[PDB]
Amino acid sequence: GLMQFTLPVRLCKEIELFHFDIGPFENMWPGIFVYMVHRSCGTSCFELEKLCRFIMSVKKNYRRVPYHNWKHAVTVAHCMYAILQNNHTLFTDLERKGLLIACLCHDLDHRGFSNSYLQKFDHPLAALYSTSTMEQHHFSQTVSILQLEGHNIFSTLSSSEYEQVLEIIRKAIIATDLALYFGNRKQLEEMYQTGSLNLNNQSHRDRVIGLMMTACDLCSVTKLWPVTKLTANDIYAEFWAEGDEMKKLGIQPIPMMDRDKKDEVPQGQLGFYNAVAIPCYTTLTQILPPTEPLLKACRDNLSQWEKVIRGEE
Numbered sequence: 001g002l003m004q005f006t007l008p009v010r011l012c013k014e015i016e017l018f019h020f021d022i023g024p025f026e027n028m029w030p031g032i033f034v035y036m037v038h039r040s041c042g043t044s045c046f047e048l049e050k051l052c053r054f055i056m057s058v059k060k061n062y063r064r065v066p067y068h069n070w071k072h073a074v075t076v077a078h079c080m081y082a083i084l085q086n087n088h089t090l091f092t093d094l095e096r097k098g099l100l101i102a103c104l105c106h107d108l109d110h111r112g113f114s115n116s117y118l119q120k121f122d123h124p125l126a127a128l129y130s131t132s133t134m135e136q137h138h139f140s141q142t143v144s145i146l147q148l149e150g151h152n153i154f155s156t157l158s159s160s161e162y163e164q165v166l167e168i169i170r171k172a173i174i175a176t177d178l179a180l181y182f183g184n185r186k187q188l189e190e191m192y193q194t195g196s197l198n199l200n201n202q203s204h205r206d207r208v209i210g211l212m213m214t215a216c217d218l219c220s221v222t223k224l225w226p227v228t229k230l231t232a233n234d235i236y237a238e239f240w241a242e243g244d245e246m247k248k249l250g251i252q253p254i255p256m257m258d259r260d261k262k263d264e265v266p267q268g269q270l271g272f273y274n275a276v277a278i279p280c281y282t283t284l285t286q287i288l289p290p291t292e293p294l295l296k297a298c299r300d301n302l303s304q305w306e307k308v309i310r311g312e313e
């Protein structure tokens, strides 16, 4: 009960910042995650023994893929921690519990392949889940781990609170399907501008939590340039592998997944910042002003990509 996690001074201070990188020491990531739960949620939110056993079973069920790996899970959960800590009073007790867990679990058992590759391959999961294929799988894996003996971290919630938290987590994980982001942000844009946005409207909270999950999931674009630049290598390492697998199915992949078109990456990054990232953090900043540093860091990285195209790096 009186057992706190404590980080070295540099990490204690930098973990509070949006652009924090969790570093290359894998054995510290569980401790970083528990530290964020204790500060974000309370030292009483979860039984430590159960949380530790939940964390290590989640870790075990992430795969050795270049990008959609255990490091991504913890990185995305840190961004959520930064949003929640900078917006103290806006989120319920259940929501703080649910969203950090949702982030840790959001890409469980990812194979490094998009929903589109699963469908073109005719993967069994494409028959089981026709839309948001991988995201329904990620939620399924989350419930499976919660039902392992000794792993139910929500045990001391009431029947109704338990149903509420799994519903928060399900919506949160489904919302990480980027195909669903565009419509969710368009609706949030209209609600914010016509002034109809109402954080007591549950359907509105869902939309706002959905956008938070997009923002955390894309947070690679909100780090300092050297982290962003090096993470891009891992992202494209997966896309190019999917591209190769498209070619094996006798389908020319989109340039984004075609390793023969590396030259086109700098311009594709501009398109992605302009079409996805900047709009995402802009709308998020309007709804939640204290998330402005995500938008500023994103704009900084857009400028860095424009310098790459101008041969300046």
Ligand SMILES: COc1ccc(-n2c(CCN3C(=O)c4ccccc4C3=O)nc3ccccc3c2=O)cc1
Residues within 6 Å of the ligand: 178, 218, 235, 255, 256, 257, 261, 264, 265, 266, 267, 268, 269, 271, 272, 273, 275, 276
């Ligand atoms: C829909 O708007 C888009 C979509 C894709 C693109 N796009 C991209 C963006 C790549 N990208 C994701 O998709 C993504 C998802 C999640 C995290 C990080 C990322 C991330 O870095 N790269 C290219 C590279 C070369 C050639 C072409 C393209 C191309 O068209 C541009 C605009």
Ligand SMILES: [Mg+2]
Residues within 6 Å of the ligand: 106, 107, 134, 176, 177
């Ligand atoms: Mg995902």
Ligand SMILES: [Zn+2]
Residues within 6 Å of the ligand: 072, 076, 106, 107, 176, 217
């Ligand atoms: Zn993800």
